[PDB]
Every structure is written in structure tokens, then in C-alpha cells.
From Swiss-Prot, chains A, B, C:
Pfam families: PglD_N. It is an enzyme of class 2 (transferase). Signal peptide: none annotated. Gene3D superfamilies: 3.40.50.20, Hexapeptide repeat proteins (2.160.10.10). Pathway: Protein modification; protein glycosylation. This is UDP-N-acetylbacillosamine N-acetyltransferase. SUPFAM superfamilies: Trimeric LpxA-like enzymes. Its EC number is 2.3.1.203. The record marks 122 as: Increases basicity of active site His. Acetyl-CoA binds at residues 130, 151, 169. GO terms for biological process: protein N-linked glycosylation via asparagine. Changing residue 114 to A: Reduction in catalytic activity. The active site is at 121 (proton acceptor).
Length: 191, 191, 191
């Protein structure tokens, strides 16, 4: 890892804090999409893509990688990762504070695991998925590529969620889902 | 910070544990409301108000401050606070273990952030609000003064909750609220 | 505590990670039920029972103890336990990462407190209960023996849950329960 890091980025400042926690000395924000090809003339410091949106993040990931940059993982020092878990190396994965990833779980490229999310044993979290703060995946859960799990949501044991699906804020997934879908929780009601 | 701390206080013992975690050597409980004025003859050790109730806490805060005491913040060493976040100095704020406060968030006087609550980037948490264990505020959320967010509750991004409002246990706030209100979740049903 | 530990066990690998975190050097898996009596001829390293099921765990606990083994607690170094809390010594209790147990709470034999669960002040968690990831018990909550609290569930202050009860995933217990029961939350609905 380099002493400096480029961040393609409000998510930018948060990723900057995580980079600094890891021991990066300086962060350089590079938010421009057009003319990105010219950035290849810059020193090859580590790169990170601080975009919460899964589809944009993947697009930028592919463009940055093609320009000769290494897209590192940003992993807060307080994140706990089982030695038997697999976190894809140099794959633009964000792992925020107090995230716990248990034995034999697998985290794929471009995933966001936000603060205090928990990935229990033997889970697979598909590429460019977004696991929001406090969201929890029980044992043997398979989350597809490009999924979104809302704040404080959860997925019960042994369940699969198909690619491209959305689990709402506070929602509890209770059945296997072989087809893409949108799965809603219950909103707070004014009384 | 002084070597000893007065705690105006079951919440008292919990605040004592946090004070000891910070490195305070001794805690002195001072629970009396009547004759509080006489306490001004005591050595001016740091003070904290360990009352979960927002209105009582503010009353005591105002009375203690008028008697020549410094009301410190009690912040567990495991709480993570972005360097760009603002936590009002010496303002009787409680920040419990494993609380995370992200970039550019602001925590006002007398707030309680209970264990494992999360305040995402650019939030404002209004004075004497009570954020319960596991409650999570997404990015750019504005919580009014004197609000209560129940256990495991959450507030979706970019939302404001008006002064003096209550969000129930497990509830998910989904819309802006310009007027005070009470917002309920769904209770566990016996089957 | 011994340098090695026997684990009666996917939960096995997870408990192994916790044992290694505590500083145990080697873990030996001993999953056989029949012929367990013969294990008494083995060196008396510390023992742990890594079974999520409350009734099986108790059965094995009783059998292992009768064979002259010490069943230790496995407590992740990141778990925070108030000095005034009581965690029954050498009682096969599992306390996972980022669990917080506040002042004067009591954790009984054979309990599982899974990752990021919170036990607030003055709680009692009954023997061989299973508190799932993210589940939170407010102040003065009494959880009976052999209870299950689902992922991200919670129990409001001052409530009792009778022996042998189940609180579902995402569910919020709101009333005292003097009789055993099953208490359900709301499932995510496909839209």
C-alpha cells in the first residue's frame, strides 16, 4: 500500500477517514469522469471508489482499472475478519468500522459493508452489493450481485437473494428468492 | 479533565463505567435536587448528568452549570468520531461504546448516543435528544431537539424529524416530518 | 485456561476463531456423541460446546461436565462487560465480538450472546438462551431460560419473557410475558 491514496468520491470524506485509519498519509480527491484517461499520467498511488451507487461504482472501477491503477480495499482497523473468510484482494471493497465477517464467508469485488453490518459464517456477498449500516446476514446466506440491503435489515439463515434485488430499511427477508425483486419492510406510522 | 467526577444519577452506574473507561479515578454520586445550590461549596470536579429523560437532564444541566461546575462529555474509548464531526465540547453529551459518528455530523449539547448507535455523515442531532441502543441515522439526517429514537430504530437518508418527536422501538422513519409527532413501529405478536 | 481447547461443534469454526482471539493456541474438534465417555481418558484441556441449539447444548454440557472436563466461557476480547455485571464463571457461555453487557446485568450458564447484541443494565439472561446477532435487551429485562431472540430483535425496558419462548427476526417485544410463547415480527414483502 502507498502512502497516498486517490479517492473518486459526502461518501468521499467518510472513505478518507477509513483510509487515514488504515495509515494512509494523504488523500487526493479525483471526482471527474470526463478526461479520466489523462489521470494515467499521474503517479500510481492506490485508488478507491467512494460511490454508494452500485452501478456507477462498477463503471468507475472498470475505467480506473483500465488506466493502470490498483483499486485497493479500504478496511477499518476495527473490522473483524475471520482468517478463513475470503475478502477479494485489491477489489475496491469498503469495510466500515465494527463490521464482523465470520468463518468461511466470502466478500466479492466492489462490495460495501457499512458500519456495524454482520456477515455470519459461510455467507457469500455478491459483487458490487451494498450492505447498509446495521444490516445482518445470518449463516449460509447468499446475496446476489448488485443487491442493496437497507439499514437494520436482515436475512434469515440459509437464504439466497437473487441478483439486482433490494431489501428495504428495517426489513427481514424470510424466504429464498430465485428471481430479482424488491422486498419492503413496514414504515413508521404517525400516531 | 479532573481525576474525580460527580455523577447526578441505574443510569448512574453505567455512566460511572464510561467515566472509568475514560480514565476517571473515582466517581461521586450526587442525586439530590433540593439543596443543589449548596454543592457549589464542593471541590469543582467535572460533572455529568446521568438521566435518560431529556427534560429532567436539561433542567439539571442548567442548575449544575449555574452553580459553577463544568459538565463534561462522557465518551467511551471505543466510540469512533470523525475528525470533521463536531461534538459540542463540555456539553454533557453521553457517547456509549461502539457508537460511530461519521464525517461532518454534529452532536449538540446534552445528547445521549447509546450503545452501537450510528450517526452517518452530515447528520445533526439536536440538543437533549436520546438515541437508543442500535438506533441508526442515515446520511444528512436532521434530528430535532428533545427527540427520542427507540431501540433498533432508523431514519432514512436526507430526512428531518421535528423537535420533540418520538420514534418507537424498531421503527423506520421514511418521510420528512416538519411537525412534532409520534411515529410507531410494529409490535411482536403472540402466535 | 489451557493452551489448547476442545470444541464440540459451522458454529465450530466460529467458536474456534473466538478461542484463538482469547489466546488459545490450538483447537481440537470433538463432535462425537456416542462414546463420549471414553474422552475422559484424554488430557483435560478446557472444553467448549459450539452448538446453537439450546437443548442439545445443555445435554452435551451435562455429559461433558460429568466426564471431568471444565467447560469454559469463550469471550471475544472486544466484548465489553461491566465490572458490576455477573457472567457465570466456567459455564459454557459464548460472548461474540462487540457484545456489550452493562452494569449489574447477569448472564447465566450456556447462554449465547451473538455479535453486536447488547444487554443493558440490570438484565437477567436465563440459562441456555440464544441472543442472535444485533438483538438488544433494554434495561431491567428478564429473559427466561431456553429463550431465542431473533436477529435484530429487541425487548423494551422492564419486560420479562417467560422460559422457552421465541422472539422472531426483527421483532420488538412490548409487553410482559408470564407464559411461554412465540412472538413474531413482520416479514419483508415482495413488491
Amino acid at each position: 500500500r502507498t502512502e497516498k491514496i486517490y479517492i473518486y468520491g459526502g461518501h468521499g470524506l467518510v472513505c478518507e477517514d477509513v483510509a487515514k485509519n488504515m495509515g494512509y498519509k494523504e488523500c487526493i480527491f479525483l471526482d471527474d469522469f470526463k478526461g479520466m484517461k489523462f489521470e494515467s499520467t499521474l503517479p500510481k498511488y492506490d485508488f478507491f471508489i467512494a460511490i454508494g451507487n452500485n452501478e456507477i461504482r462498477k463503471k468507475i472501477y472498470q475505467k480506473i482499472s483500465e488506466n493502470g491503477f490498483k483499486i485497493v480495499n479500504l478496511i477499518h482497523k476495527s473490522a473483524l475478519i475471520s482468517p478463513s473468510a475470503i475478502v477479494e484482494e485489491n477489489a475496491g471493497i469498503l469495510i466500515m468500522p465494527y463490521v464482523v465477517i465470520n468463518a468461511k464467508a466470502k466478500i466479492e469485488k466492489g462490495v460495501i459493508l457499512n458500519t456495524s453490518s454482520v456477515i455470519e459464517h459461510e455467507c457469500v456477498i455478491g459483487e458490487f452489493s451494498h450492505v447498509s449500516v446495521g444490516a445482518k446476514c445470518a449463516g449460509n446466506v447468499k446475496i446476489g450481485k448488485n443487491c442493496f440491503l437497507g439499514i437494520n435489515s436482515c436475512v434469515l439463515p440459509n437464504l439466497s437473494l437473487a441478483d439486482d434485488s433490494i431489501l428495504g430499511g428495517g426489513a427481514t427477508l424470510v424466504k429464498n428468492q430465485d428471481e430479482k425483486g424488491v422486498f419492503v419492510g413496514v414504515p413508521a406510522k404517525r400516531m
